Design a protein around this nucleic acid. Sequence first.
DNA 1: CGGGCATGCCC
DNA 2: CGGGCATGCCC
Lengths: 197, 197
Amino acid sequence: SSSVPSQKTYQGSYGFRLGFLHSGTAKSVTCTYSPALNKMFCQLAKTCPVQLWVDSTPPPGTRVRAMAIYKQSQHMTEVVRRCPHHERCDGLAPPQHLIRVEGNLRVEYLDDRNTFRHSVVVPYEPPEVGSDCTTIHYNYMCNRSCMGGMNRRPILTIITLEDSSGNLLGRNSFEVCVCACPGRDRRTEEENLRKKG
Amino acid sequence: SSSVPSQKTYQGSYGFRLGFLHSGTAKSVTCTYSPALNKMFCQLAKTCPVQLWVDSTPPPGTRVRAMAIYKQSQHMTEVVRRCPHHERCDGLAPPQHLIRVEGNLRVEYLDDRNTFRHSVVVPYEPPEVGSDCTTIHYNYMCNRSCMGGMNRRPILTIITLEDSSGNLLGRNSFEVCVCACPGRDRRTEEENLRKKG
DNA sequence: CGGGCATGCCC
DNA sequence: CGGGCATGCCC
Ligand SMILES: *C[C@H]1C(=O)C2CCN1CC2
Ligand SMILES: *C[C@H]1C(=O)C2CCN1CC2
Ligand SMILES: *C[C@H]1C(=O)C2CCN1CC2
Ligand SMILES: *C[C@H]1C(=O)C2CCN1CC2
Ligand SMILES: C[C@@H]1C(=O)C2CCN1CC2
Ligand SMILES: C[C@@H]1C(=O)C2CCN1CC2
Ligand SMILES: [Zn+2]
Ligand SMILES: [Zn+2]
């Protein structure tokens, strides 16, 4: 009955975890992940690699879904959407969707008929031989600050592993801040965490 | 042949001048006019009174037109428009128009067929007996900072007095900055003028 | 109300 | 590149 999807971490029977490349906090970096905050800082429309880790290999036909939700209680029931400006500015991705996947010939974009929430889905592919994870290249097509979209409200990205039958196999999430200067904003929030948290 | 309307002050044979109420520079004022900068600072969608002064009474059927243009040379040829967000948010005023007139049952909104520029027109009415000017209540429906609209670019409002035949009778203009805190921004720009101009 | 931070971006 | 200002708004 809820229109708010779960954000509860569920590693599940396949040991599903997310991973992120080690970047620095240089003021001009295009993205950087804070493990202390479980938070990705990245720039508008630029690659944001997410690693998928599993302890056991999911069955054939497993799918990987990404969806954004507002992190604060007072905004959780509102659907996260592209702002009118960037919407009016790919072909496969409808202009209303915040999250895109690049580099994948099998991407599917969903608008839920009951909850109206947007998600983007790709097939799960096992890591190549010798590699321990699979990487998906996400793109966030608005800044957190965009008026008429996120309007400065923080968001979570929820990644779910789902089998072809629709069984939830795993769930993980991270906060995302799409901003002009990811390195500066990570440094500021981490400093604020240490001194005022 | 030019698609850029004139901004040249032309008092004309009727002695046409603009006037503005004396406001202060309190941080929360809804609008304030700087004579030193010939610049109105005002808030989004709130009243911005403009006084019309004439030395001689224009003929019956005179009209008062307002139009915005970008002040900087590099943007002058681009049409000033409402941003996509506030456009998607009166009835008589088309959503694309930046400048509205409130309180007037005879307002006309024009989209020029050749230049595509927007303007808003009302009849000229002489001042009431004993009064020296006529006031028009303008509304600016975007902030200067709106992405996809003015996008932080400065603008002029050009007020023209025109007879019913379309003869230009007078022209005046002022800079406009639609901002959150008109009193603060006037104080800052005037201080910057005095010390760095 | 006014002080002050967060965030985009400096033509 | 990084320093720093301008501007919206603080839940
Ligand atoms: C944002 C992400 C990238 O695209 C590379 C630079 C920074 N971070 C790790 C690798
Ligand atoms: C963070 C800041 C920089 O360092 C350049 C890229 C992003 N932003 C504007 C210029
Ligand atoms: C903005 C304009 C108004 O509406 C009154 C207050 C400030 N200024 C003069 C009168
Ligand atoms: C300027 C500042 C104020 O003083 C209030 C009105 C406008 N802005 C936000 C709150
Ligand atoms: C997760 C794993 C790694 O650490 C590197 C880059 C991505 N994957 C294969 C090698
Ligand atoms: C221009 C003139 C004034 O100064 C007051 C207010 C508006 N007009 C009539 C009286
Ligand atoms: Zn946007
Ligand atoms: Zn706007």
